[PDB]
Amino acid sequence: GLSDGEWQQVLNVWGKVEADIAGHGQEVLIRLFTGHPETLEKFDKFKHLKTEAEMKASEDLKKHGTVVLTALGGILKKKGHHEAELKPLAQSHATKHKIPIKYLEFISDAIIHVLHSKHPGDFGADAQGAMTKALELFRNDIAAKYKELGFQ
């Protein structure tokens, strides 16, 4: 439950991401994989990446970063009205990719970390608060569908 002022901040911040969706998506995935290496095991096409240099040099990782952040962007632009957009993601991640909700927490914090990293002093406290709440909303709604499916 975000206010209009908070969604405004969210989409304001998202403008930063959209000026370089591939760069942002790349660094988010890298921060995830290096900060929580067990996450890497969920990707049959990234499990080969041992080193961070390999991650950085991988165009397919940047491609997936784009896919992920494009999907997230679409969801964020719905300002909470994302049932249609979210349900298939929740289903594919629960039943096909088998991604525990913990990993969604991991990538949420990673998004936060990357925005500070790429925009130091340009990602204010109010913007962090708004973005955090949005990612929590996202997670909580996924979490509801996970429960429904009985998935851990």
Nearest to ligand HEM of 5, 140 (CB atom): 140
Nearest partner of 40 among 99, 115, 91, 112, judged by Cα: 99
Structure tokens that stand for 60 in this block: 């397919």
Report how many residues bind ligand HEM under the rule CB under 6 A: 16
Q: Report the site for ligand HEM in 61-120 (rule: CB under 6 A).
A: 67-68, 71-72, 89, 92-93, 97, 99, 103-104, 107
Nearest to ligand HEM of 43, 151 (CB atom): 43
CB of 13 within 8 A of CB of 123?
A: yes
Min dist CB 17 to ligand HEM, Å, is: 12
**Helices in the chain by DSSP H: which ranges?**
4-18, 21-35, 52-57, 59-76, 83-91, 101-118, 125-149
List contacts with ligand HEM (CB under 6 A): 39, 42-43, 45, 67-68, 71-72, 89, 92-93, 97, 99, 103-104, 107
